[PDB]
Every structure is written in structure tokens, then in C-alpha cells.
């Protein structure tokens, strides 16, 4: 059984989950919970971090026994689960245009992350303002991408349109605005959700939309 | 003739021009300056910056119009650059190891990045205070990866030991002091610079260690 291990938050574990759902492959769901207010301890991590044989000790890592795999980056992750169910490119073009948009989708996890983890309120509140004179702009660069196409390559899938749906989502729910005049990113999120598999995961008693970071930041964090 | 474009600092592009001095590609390198102080406008970039026909118009990005290549992520460009020179992985084995180095690198770059532009003085410091605290544990990590190899994946270099090299180079400007557990890195970083085209390159007239950040950074802005 393969073992994918991750906090109780959506966070850089969902596109990962969004893939094994869609591609059928079981996996067991190793979850780590933070300590208690006002600190949310991560004893639960710290005390197993270096016991499960990782070269780079990180939430998420992805263990296979049976394969004799052992890792622990997203990317890393996702791409050998895309490169093992096909969901990668097929000539050297489809790779450029997909690897661009996993780390323009990375860029944004980045740009969001420094906002939402911001203690200051003050500060947060810059890097709000700041970040909704960002946005705009890169999301436009997406749906330009995009045009109408179904998926961000066409009509086939990649693993980069399971990182664009999370953080678009995450993006979508911290300030529905920004797509008030992006219908063509909206529908591709409803799409996406309209994918048997998704649909299925997204419907679980498991699934909640809340929370996205960890409990010890300003946005997400709180079911 | 290839184009990179950058800004006049090491940042993000000189992992891909070691690895482009390295393979002995021609490129024109096109530079972009600062303002004068105290706002240091970017507007020799800004000016310019959707005219160029990028889908995700960011810095750096590599333009080659006889192959009709015309791209904007480090991390894609540097993929690129390495799958043309094949200077990937040769198993799927392999390009795991690779994959999860290229992303622990990143992962440095990260962390020293929301440091180092820190806006705020009191956050600054704390910054600095937990870098110094979690950095000797990622190197120590680096360090037991490589053990007894020449480069990190093994005796054949990869894309990841140019994108390694640059970040351990600023952390080591930053703290000489990070590396006193993790000696056996420092011996990396003088087998890289031995390679004859990297001599050749750190050797340029051209070449300097400082700048390595923007002149808006807390450190790396100044020559
Ligand atoms: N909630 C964040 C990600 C949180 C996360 O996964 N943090 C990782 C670091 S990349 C972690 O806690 N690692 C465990 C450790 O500190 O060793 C997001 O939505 O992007
Ligand atoms: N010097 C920084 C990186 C600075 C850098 O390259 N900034 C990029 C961000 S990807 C930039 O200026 N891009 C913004 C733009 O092109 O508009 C480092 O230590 O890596």
C-alpha cells in the first residue's frame, strides 16, 4: 500500500490527492494534526521526521515499499505520479508549456503563502493590497493561456491542471472578486470538478473546503 | 541566436548560465539595470515586459526564435537547457533523486528570498533567527545525500548541481559559519568551480560575487 503523508489541510497535499483519485491508484492517507493553541505545535512531525528513512525530511513525502520509493517534494511527487499514469507531456512542446504553468502555479502558492502566513496585521494588510494588484494580472496571463481549451494542454489532462484547480480554489475563496470577470477560469474549475473522480472526492465526508493553511495563519487555517 | 534575459544580479539566472557555459551553447545575455536610488525603478523591464511576446512575462526568461522556443520559469528553462544537452536523469531512479534536490534547492531559495526582501526591520530579524535555525539541518541533509559522490546524484553532473551550487555560493556569503557541520559541501562547491568552463566563466572580468539580490534587499543588493 502506498503511503502519502500530509497535515490535516488541504495545502501543496490536495493536487497530489485530486491525481490518485482521478488515475484510481489506492494509497493509504497518513495525516499529522498540530498541537493545541496558541502555538499549534508540530511534536506530531518533529518526533517521526527523521525515523522513515527520507533523504530530505518534508510534509509532504510519498513512500512506495513495493516500488522501493521514498520522497518528499510536492513536485517530485506529483510529477513521478504524472510521469507513471501518463499525465505528462508527449513532445518536448506539451513539457514546456506544462512545466511553465506548474511553476507559474508554484509562483502563486508562493505569492499567496507570504500573505496568508503573515503574523503583523498591519503588514498583512499590505501584503493584501499588494497581492490584489498582483492577481489580476496572472490570472488574465492563465486565461490567455488557456483560451478554449479544456485543460490547460487541451483536451487531454495533466497533473499541472490538479496544482491549477487547488490553488485557483484556494485564490477563489479567499476573494471570489478576482474572477469576476474570468467565467473562462470558473468554468475550467467547474470542469475539473465535474470530473467522475473529483466529483467523488470533492463529495466526502473527508473533503471540506476549510481549512487550506495551517491553524496558525491569518487566511485558511480554521474549518 | 538564443536570448536569456535577467536582471544584472545572480539571483535566479546563473544557475542556467553555468549550465549554459558548461554545455558551451551560444546565448546573448540581455541585462537589465536598476533606477537610481532611492526607488530603483525597474522600468528598463517594465517598459518591455508584455512586448515580448511571453505568455507569463517574468525575468528570467530565454527566447530562441530559430526553434521557436520563447519561455518564463527558471526551473523550465533550466529543464529545457538540460533535457537538449542531456544533462537529465537516465532512469526514472535517477530523475527522482534529481527531482527532489532540484526542489530542496528551490526550497533554499525560498526561504532565504522571504528573508532577505523582508520589508519590515522586527520581522527581519526574526526571519534571520529561524533561517539560522533550520539551515544547518537542510545542509547537514545535502551533505549525507552526497557522501563520498563527486556531484550530488552521482559521478555524471546534472542541471541540479549548477542550480545547488548558486544557492550554497549565497548562503555561504550570508553565513560562512551554516557550513561547520557540513564541510563536506565546501569540497563540492571547489569541485564545481574547477569544472574548465566554470573557471573559465567565475574567472570573466564580468563575474561577481556580489550582487546577488536586488539593491531593495536587506542583503546580496550591493557590489
Ligand atoms: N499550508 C501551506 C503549506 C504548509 C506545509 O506543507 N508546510 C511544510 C513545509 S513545505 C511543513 O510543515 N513541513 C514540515 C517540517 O517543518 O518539517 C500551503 O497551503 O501552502
Ligand atoms: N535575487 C533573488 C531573485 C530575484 C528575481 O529574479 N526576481 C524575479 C521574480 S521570479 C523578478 O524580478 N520577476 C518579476 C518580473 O519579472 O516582473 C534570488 O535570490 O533568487
Redesign the pocket.
Given at each position: 500500500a502506498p503511503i502519502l503523508g500530509?497535515?490535516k489541510?488541504?495545502?501543496?497535499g490536495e493536487p497530489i490527492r485530486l491525481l490518485l483519485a482521478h488515475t484510481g491508484q489506492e494509497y493509504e492517507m497518513k495525516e499529522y494534526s498540530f498541537g493545541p493553541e496558541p502555538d499549534y505545535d508540530?511534536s506530531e512531525?518533529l518526533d517521526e521526521?527523521f525515523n522513515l528513512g527520507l533523504d530530505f525530511?518534508?510534509?509532504?513525502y510519498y513512500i512506495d515499499e513495493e516500488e522501493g520509493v521514498k520522497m518528499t517534494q510536492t513536485v517530485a511527487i506529483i510529477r513521478y505520479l504524472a510521469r507513471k499514469h501518463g499525465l505528462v507531456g508527449e513532445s518536448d512542446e506539451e513539457t514546456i508549456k506544462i512545466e511553465m504553468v506548474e511553476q507559474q502555479a508554484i509562483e502563486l502558492?508562493f505569492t499567496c503563502?507570504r500573505t496568508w502566513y503573515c503574523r503583523d496585521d498591519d503588514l498583512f494588510d499590505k501584503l493584501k493590497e499588494e497581492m490584489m494588484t498582483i492577481l489580476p494580472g496572472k490570472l488574465i496571463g492563465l486565461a490567455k493561456f488557456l483560451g478554449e481549451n479544456q485543460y490547460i494542454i487541451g483536451d487531454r489532462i495533466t497533473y499541472v491542471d490538479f496544482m491549477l484547480y487547488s490553488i485557483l480554489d484556494y485564490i477563489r475563496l479567499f476573494e471570489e472578486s478576482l474572477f469576476d470577470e474570468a467565467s473562462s477560469l470558473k468554468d475550467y474549475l467547474t470542469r475539473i470538478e465535474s470530473l467522475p473522480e473529483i466529483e467523488k472526492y470533492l463529495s466526502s465526508d473527508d473533503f471540506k473546503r476549510f481549512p487550506?493553511?495551517?491553524p496558525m495563519?491569518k487566511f485558511g487555517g480554521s474549518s
Open positions: 500530509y497535515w489541510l488541504r495545502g501543496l508540530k512531525w521526521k525530511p518534508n510534509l509532504p502558492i503563502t487550506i493553511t495551517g495563519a
